[PDB]
């Protein structure tokens, strides 16, 4: 919801 | 919802 | 929910 | 929920 | 540097 | 450096 | 360095 | 270095 | 905090 | 905190 | 903390 | 803590 | 020099 | 030098 | 030098 | 040198 | 602090 | 601190 | 601390 | 500490 | 001539 | 001539 | 001539 | 000439 960081 | 950062 | 970091 | 780091 | 985000 | 996030 | 996250 | 996370 | 410097 | 420096 | 330096 | 240095 | 900070 | 910090 | 910190 | 820290 | 001289 | 001289 | 001289 | 000289 | 500091 | 510091 | 520090 | 420190 707040922060979604995908690599 | 707030921040979505995708790499 | 807060932070999701996937490598 | 908070931090999910997968390698 | 490329991205500099300060919250 | 490429990404610099400061919370 | 590539990612620098400071919480 | 590649990832530097400081909590 | 008192100081947040993103160089 | 008192100081947060992201160099 | 008093100091958080991410070099 | 008093010092957290991530070099 | 590049930076002179007298705190 | 690059940095001179007198705390 | 690169860094001179007088704490 | 690269670092001179006088604590 | 009492005296702060920056040259 | 009492005297802080930065040259 | 009493005297802090940085040259 | 009483005197801190950094050259 | 330039600076005279006496304690 | 330049700086005279006496304690 | 330059710096004279006497204790 | 440069620095004279006497204790």
Author numbering:
A (entry chain L), B (entry chain F), C (entry chain R), D (entry chain X), E (entry chain E), F (entry chain K), ...: 1 to 7
Task: Copy text from the publication.
To address this issue, we have used cryo-electron microscopy (cryo-EM) to determine the molecular structure of an amyloid fibril that is formed from peptide PNF-18. This 7-mer peptide (sequence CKFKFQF) was artificially designed as retroviral transduction enhancer and increases HIV-1 infection rates of TZM-bl cells by a factor of more than a hundred-fold. Each protofilament (PF) is built by two paired cross-β sheets that interact by the hydrophobic side of the amphipathic peptide, while the polar residues are pointing outwards, creating a positive surface. These structural features provide insights into the molecular basis of amyloid polymorphism and virus binding, and improves our understanding of the molecular basis of peptide nanofibrils as retroviral transduction enhancers.
We achieved a spatial resolution of 2.86 Å, based on the 0.143 Fourier shell correlation (FSC) criterion. There were, depending on the position of the peptide stack in the fibril structure, three topological types of peptide stacks (α, β and γ) that were arranged into pairs, which we refer to hereafter as PFs. Morphology II consists of three PFs, two peripheral ones and a central one, and six peptides in each molecular layer. The peptide conformation is kinked and shows two chemically different sides: a hydrophobic side that is formed by residues Phe3, Phe5, and Phe7 and a polar one that is formed by the side chains of Cys1, Lys2, Lys4, Gln6 as well as the N- and C-terminal groups of the polypeptide backbone. The peptide’s amphipathic properties lead to two modes by which two peptides (or cross-β sheets) may interact within the plane of the fibril cross-section: a hydrophobic and a polar contact mode. The hydrophobic contact mode occurs between the two type α peptide stacks and between a type β and a type γ stack. The polar contact mode, which occurs between type α and β peptide stacks, involves an interdigitation of the side chains of residues Lys4 and Gln6, similar to a steric zipper. The zipper-like region is flanked on both sides by an intermolecular charge pair that is formed by the ε-amino group of Lys4 and α-carboxy group of the peptide C-terminus. Only the peptides in stack γ, which are bound through the hydrophobic contact mode to stack β, adopt an angle of almost 45° relative to the fibril z-axis. Morphology II shows a strongly cationic Coulomb surface potential, which originates mainly from the side chains of Lys2 and Lys4, and the α-amino group of Cys1.
